[model samples]
Target: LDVCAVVPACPKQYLSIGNQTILEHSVHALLAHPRVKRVVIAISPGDSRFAQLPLANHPQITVVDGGDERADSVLAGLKAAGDAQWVLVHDAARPCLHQDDLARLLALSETSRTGGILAAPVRDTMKRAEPGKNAIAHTVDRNGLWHALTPQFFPRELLHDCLTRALNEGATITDEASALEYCGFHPQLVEGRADNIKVTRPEDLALAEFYLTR
Candidate 1:
């Protein structure tokens, strides 16, 4: 299966770790895998930051106008993925993906009829934090609970169809796998390194830098 990466785009205050922006690191990491021939990014209709990137003209990358939400942008990107059998839907802010992690996730294809995601099993005790309450809401079980990570692999056609249906039905699809889950498909959770984190808040920028340079 040919590899294509789909990224939901944003930029600038996108939390830079250094000279490189958050999405750049995500792109470079996907490029680390030889099988991953290209990245299809979806930015806002008027997004101008993407045009300024060094990789804007890169042969391995393609840019498309995105929609308001993550699922929408993913759909926008997937539409431009051509005829690739499988696509890896990754977050633009998650930049610490290791080659070993990508390799391991790809192995799922051998047995995965529906596909899988790079995920990390929860280690910390979980809790349900309800709004307006200071006291504990309840303790959530961590067993078999996974913190979903990116580069979620799925068949392009299946993903497109599932996501389209999910969006049409108003399902809250935060990730590609969740869309599959909504479609009655159970995707495998391949354990990946915890360092494959998404940099969101300001502090995460430093933490991402620590992991990247470490």
Candidate 2:
């Protein structure tokens, strides 16, 4: 299985507590996996963490300077995909991704035309809360709703074309799949573990640690 890990690096301020150290650990973990062929980090110009890290020592790793937005960072990685048939885009903050979950997602993507991503179906009734208080404005239909996780996979060429089109149209594409959806492709969602969560807020760290050990 030929696979590469793409870690997007933004400003250090955007990272969670101990994020740089965690990201380094995540890189090392990916490198340790026998299936992983390479690990590429997409860093922005003013990123202090990338400047300070000793990632250059690893020959299996390549660091590409990133762009102003997340989509741009992804595009930079896509350019680096080279001749790899499949590309997997993972979030740097999701350090707690289980190996089994990664395996399952990758296996699913191998035969999928529309590609696939690690996601969990929404179990709770989602609500649109207004700016005010605890009152719920509206309850969203959870019929086909899912909470998207990282390690979104796609055919390299298709994803690249989708992103290129979105950029040309002056539209802000939230995720890789969104751009693919715009291009008339319904990307599949691989049912992922609940523990594959993105480390966004401070409280998430503790939860991540718990999940990691569990």
Candidate 3:
């Protein structure tokens, strides 16, 4: 199977510090996986740091320009996937994804009725709080709730069709699976490791480094 890995990168303040390093690690991790045929990093327009990475020189890596939002960036990468059978959308901020977790997601997608995403089941009790208020609005049922993660895998044509329709409808999707949901396709939530987290703040780098070494 030809599996393409797509990572979306945007212009942000934190990227200048260590985001590039994190992204490099992510690309390296995917490249090491035997199932991955190619890796694509989609950057937003005017991003100068796009081609300043080692992955740019890798033969299996391809860099494409992104659009305005996250969905747009994913779409750009999808376009570059060509005729690959499968596409895995991963986040640039997540650098600690284990190969075992990726394999699990792929396995689930293979048997899934509508494809799926790698996620972790919520272990803690959930609550809904009002915006800017500490009062709890209601207790959310955590029976089937799962924390969504990156490396969402799907069939190439299914993903492309969903994303294209979403763009035409002026819908803003935050994740690839959400676009599939918009198109009435329910995706399976495959359980993954909790350690695979997104690095959004400065403190996350420390946690990520520790995870990478382990």
Candidate 4:
């Protein structure tokens, strides 16, 4: 089955890791995989920065108007994805995605009907911090815990249906898998490299640069 990648590049960001912008790196990661035929990026309605980027005229890339929320933007990408059997929803912030991890996630299409996501098993001693303070409430069990990462792969129709229903009923969905979980589907968790981190802070850009170069 052919695969199409949907990148939720809705929020505006001007951060660059290496020579390319973070958004470009994120989309490039998907394009690195041969199975990913094309990419559909959901950008904010009036995002002017995207037009100045090289991806705007890329042959394999398609741009669509995104919504205020992440799920809405993802839905827009899904709608633009014409006939792909499977779709991979990736975060625009995660630029250090490895091809191996992507391959592992894509492999789920054959073995998993519910699909799966690239994640990293929790390694550190878990701590539940207090809501408004720096105090540690208690040590939470790290067993069976995994840090969910991006490039969440699933059947396009299944994800679309679940996401639409989840959003319609006002469920608190954090990612694509949450929508599936809400619909009673347990997506497999494919262990990915921990270095595949989401660039959340100023220091993360340095980390991504290191990962990309190394």
In terms of lDDT, the best-performing candidate is 4
Ranking by TM-score: 4, 1, 3, 2
TM-score of every prediction relative to native: 0.93, 0.86, 0.91, 0.94
lDDT tens digits by residue: candidate 3, 1-214: 7789888763222353344577777776677778788987887787766577666788898888777577778878888886678888888878888888888887864597678998999999899998789999999999998899988999988988898899889777879998999999999887888889788877877787788776
> Per-residue lDDT of 161-205 in model 1, one digit per residue for the tens?
899999999998888899999999999999899998887777887
lDDT of each: 0.86, 0.74, 0.80, 0.89
Model 2: number of backbone collisions? 1
Candidate 4 lDDT over 57-113, as tens digits, reads 999999987676878999999888888989999988888899989998999999999
Q: How well does model 3 score by local distance difference test? A: 0.80
Residue-level error in angstroms, candidate 1, position 157 = 0.8
The window of 10 residues in a row where model 3 has the poorest summed lDDT is 10-19
Error of 1 at 164 (Å): 0.5
Query: Considering TM-score, which of the candidate structures 1 and 4 is the better prediction for this target?
Result: 4
The residue-by-residue lDDT of candidate 2 on 1-214, one tens digit each, is 5777677652222343344455664666566667678777787777656556666567777778767577778778767765667777777777777777778777865578978888989999899887798888889899899998878878777887888888888766877888888888888888878887777677777776677665
Clashes of each: 0, 1, 0, 0
Best-to-worst lDDT order: 4, 1, 3, 2
lDDT of 2: 0.74
| Model 3 misplaced regions, further than 4 Å | 10-20
User: Per-residue lDDT for 72 in model 4?
Assistant: 90
